Design a protein around this ligand. Structure first.
Ligand SMILES: [Mg+2]
Ligand SMILES: [Mg+2]
Lengths: 415, 415
C-alpha cells in the first residue's frame, strides 16, 4: 500500500553509541510541506545538491526520498490520512529528515501535525539558531548584535495539548476535583471554564539543558541563559530554572560566580568559562532588544521558546529565513519555520531561506560541515548582493527582485 | 493599631451607577513601593500636585494618604505583614490609589504581592498603554509607529498560582487523577513532575474584552486585536478568541468583514468602524516590530499581556516609563510597572516616568483630564528637551543628565 519509494542507489544512516554513521550516499526523507512548500522545497533540493556536489566533488550524494504529511498526505494516501504511521516509522528509520511548512486543519478535532511529529518521535529539542545576515532589512538599528541559539524544550509544557473545553463533562469533572479534593480556591470563575494542564519534569528539563550545555561546549559559546517565569510559576518554570542550574553543577562542574546565582562551566576543550545564568521571560523579551550581545545559547520551555524564537527572528529580519530543527536521541527532523502562505503557493516567489538554512543545519548534523558552510556562504553572498526575493526587496532600495527559484540559484552562485 | 492616618482635609471618592463621584478634595491612598519607590514616589507626588494646582488653579487638591505593602509594611506593622488586610480595605474604600515598585520575598512561600493585590481586589483589567515619546532613545528605527493600548486579563490564566511541586504528595495525587481518571496520556514524564493549571472562563473573557471594546469606542480607536495561542491551547486561548468575537457580536453589533473572521463595530458616537480581529501570540510578537501601525487596542490573557506589554515597552524605549493600571468594578490601583532596582534605591537617579505617567492615568480615571494632559505635556517637553535621567542620557549625545527629582521638575517646567 505504501507509496513511498526507496531510492535504488542510496544507503540508510545508522546510529551507534550516540553517533550517526552517515554513508556517502545517504537516503534522506523529505516532506514537501503544504502551501509554499511546493516552491521552497524544490529550491532547497537544488541548493543542497549543489552544495554537496561542490563540497565533496561528486564523491557524496544524497538520495532524497519523499514521504508524506499534511494536505499532500491526504491526496496521496486518502481522505483522513494527515499523518501516516509510516512517516513516523521512516523518519525514525532513516534518522535524518527535512520538511516544508505544514498546517493542521480546523473542524475535525485534529491537533497540530508539527507537534504530533515532535511528540511522537520524542524530538525533545527544538533548535533555533538566530543570527543576522548582513544585508537583510531589519526593523532594529543593530541586528548584527544578535547571534543566539535557542534550545526550546519540545515534549512538555502547556503544549502537551492537555486541556478540556468549557462546559464539557470532563472540564466539570476536573474542576470539581481541583476545588473539592485539591482545595483549589484560585479559580476566579469555575463555571464555563476551559482548563489546561502545564507539566514539567526534572528529566524533561535535564535532557534539554544538558543538550544546550553540551552545545555551548562543542561550539565554544559564551553562555547558557535559562529563560523562565519562575516568579509566578514556581513549580513549573521555576523548577526548570532550578534543575537547569543543578544539572550545570552535577554534570559540568559549574562553580558559583560572585554570590550567585550565576555559575561558570569551564569548556573542557577550550578552557573558556561558559556563564550559566537566567532571566525572567518577560524581561528577556526586552533584553533581546536592549542587550542582544549579552546573550548567546538560550535554554527554555516549549511556549517561551516559541515566543522567543519568533521575536528574535523578527528583529534580525529573518521572519522568513529562520532555520529550525527537532532533535531527539534516535532521529531528527529539520523544518521550514515559517507558515504555508497558501495565497502565494505556486507563484515561485516566496523566500526559501528558511528551509534552505534548515537543510544547512541538516548537513552539519550529518557531519557534512563543508557542504553546510557552502550553503551559509551562498546565503551571505546572495543576501549581501541585494539580489533577493520580494519579502526582502519590498523593504529595500536598488535591490534586484528575484523569484524563489532564482534566489536559490543566487545562493548556489555565491558558494 | 492602624498606622494609616486619614487626612483631616479631604473627602472620599464614591461610586454610583458605575460612575465615580470625585470631590475637589479627594483622598488618594498611595503605597511608596520598595527600592526606588523611595525616589520615584516623591517625584510623582510633586508633579501630580503641580499638575492639579495648575490645571484647576487651586480649586482642587488631592489629599494623599499613605498605606503600606511590601518591605515597608513589615517595618511599619511588623515582621510578617507584607500585605495588611486594611490596605485591601482602604484601596477598595477609596476607589482610586497608586503605588511604587513592589517585590515579593523568596524563601517564605509567599506569592506575588502585585498579583495578591490584583486578584484580591478583583482588579481584572491590566491597562498598559504603550506610545512613543519623541526624543526617547529606542533600539528600533520607527518607534513612533507604536501607539497601542494593552487590555490584559488579570484574574485568570496560569497566573492564578495554581500549581504543585515535583515529588510532592499533591502533585502525585493530581497526576494520578489525570492519568487514571482523566485518561491523560500526554504527560511525557509523570514522575518528578511539577503541575500547573491554566484556567479561562467565558465570564472572565467577556468582562475583559467588553472593557477593551468600550475603551476603543470611548477613545475612538481604530481596532481591537484579540491575541492568543488558540492553535495549540484551543480550550483556553482559543476560547478567549471565540468569546471575544462573540461578545463583539452579541453586545456591539459586530458585522462580518469579507468572509471572516474579522468583525466591524460601528462606534456609536463617531460612526467609525472599529475592526475586531485576532493574531496568534507568537506572530504578534513579530508583528509589533514589523507592522506596529496596523495595531491599536489589544485584548489578551494574563501571561501574554505580560509579555506583550514588556516587549512593546522595550521597543519604544519605555522600559522605565511605561504606565500601568489595575482596574475593577469597585476600585482601581495604578502602579509603576518597572522593578524596584534596590542598588539605586535612595540615589535619586532613577527615572520616575513610569509612576508619573501612571498617575496621569489615575487623574484621567478621576475625570481630571486637564491635569492628566498637563502631565503628558510636561513629559513630552522634558523628554524632547533631552533633559533626562541617566537611563535615557547614557544612550544619547548632548543630553543633560538630570536626577530623579530634577526630571520631575523638568516635567513640571514643561507643563
Ligand atoms: Mg511558529
Ligand atoms: Mg512585569
Amino acid at each position: 500500500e505504501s507509496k513511498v519509494v526507496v531510492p535504488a542507489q542510496g544507503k540508510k544512516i545508522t546510529l551507534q553509541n550516540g553517533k550517526l554513521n552517515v554513508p556517502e550516499n545517504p537516503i534522506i526523507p523529505y516532506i514537501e510541506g503544504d502551501g509554499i512548500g511546493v516552491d521552497v522545497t524544490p529550491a532547497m533540493l537544488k541548493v543542497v545538491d549543489a552544495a554537496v556536489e561542490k563540497a565533496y566533488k561528486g564523491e557524496r550524494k544524497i538520495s532524497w526520498m519523499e514521504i508524506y504529511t499534511g494536505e499532500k498526505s491526504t491526496q496521496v494516501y486518502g481522505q483522513d490520512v494527515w499523518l501516516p504511521a509510516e512517516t513516523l516509522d521512516l523518519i525514525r528509520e532513516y534518522r535524518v529528515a527535512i520538511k516544508g511548512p505544514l498546517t493542521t486543519p480546523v473542524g475535525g478535532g485534529i491537533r497540530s501535525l508539527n507537534v504530533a511529529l515532535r511528540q511522537e518521535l520524542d524530538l525533545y529539542i527544538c533548535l533555533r539558531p538566530v543570527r543576522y545576515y548582513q544585508g537583510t532589512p531589519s526593523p532594529v538599528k543593530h541586528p548584527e548584535l544578535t547571534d543566539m541559539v535557542i534550545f526550546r524544550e519540545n515534549s512538555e509544557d502547556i503544549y502537551a495539548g492537555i486541556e478540556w473545553k468549557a462546559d464539557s463533562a470532563d472540564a466539570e469533572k476536573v474542576i470539581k476535583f481541583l476545588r473539592e479534593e485539591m482545595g483549589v480556591k484560585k479559580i476566579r470563575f469555575p463555571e464555563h471554564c476551559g482548563i489546561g494542564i502545564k507539566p514539567c519534569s526534572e528529566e524533561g528539563t535535564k535532557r534539554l539543558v544538558r543538550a544546550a550545555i553540551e552545545y555551548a561546549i562543542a561550539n565554544d559559546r559564551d553562555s547558557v541563559t535559562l529563560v523562565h517565569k519562575g516568579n509566578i510559576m514556581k513549580f513549573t518554570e521555576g523548577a526548570f530554572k532550578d534543575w537547569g542550574y543543578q544539572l550545570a553543577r552535577e554534570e559540568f562542574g559549574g562553580e558559583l560566580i560572585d554570590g550567585g546565582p550565576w555559575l561558570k562551566v569551564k569548556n573542557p576543550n577550550t578552557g573558556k568559562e561558559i556563564v550559566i545564568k537566567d532571566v525572567i521571560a518577560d524581561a528577556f523579551l526586552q533584553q533581546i532588544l536592549l542587550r542582544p550581545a549579552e546573550y548567546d545559547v538560550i535554554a527554555c520551555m516549549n511556549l517561551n521558546g516559541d515566543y522567543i524564537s519568533d521575536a528574535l527572528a523578527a528583529q534580525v529580519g529573518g521572519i522568513g529565513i529562520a532555520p529550525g530543527a527537532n532533535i531527539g536521541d534516535e532521529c531528527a527532523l529539520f523544518e521550514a519555520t515559517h507558515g504555508t502562505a497558501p495565497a502565494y503557493a505556486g507563484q515561485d516567489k516566496v523566500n526559501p531561506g528558511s528551509i534552505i538554512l534548515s537543510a544547512e543545519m541538516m548537513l552539519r548534523h550529518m557531519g557534512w560541515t563543508e557542504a553546510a558552510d557552502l550553503i551559509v556562504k551562498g546565503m551571505e553572498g546572495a543576501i549581501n548582493a541585494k539580489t533577493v526575493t520580494y519579502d526582502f526587496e519590498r523593504l529595500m532600495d536598488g535591490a534586484k527582485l528575484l523569484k524563489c527559484s532564482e534566489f536559490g540559484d543566487a545562493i548556489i552562485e555565491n558558494m
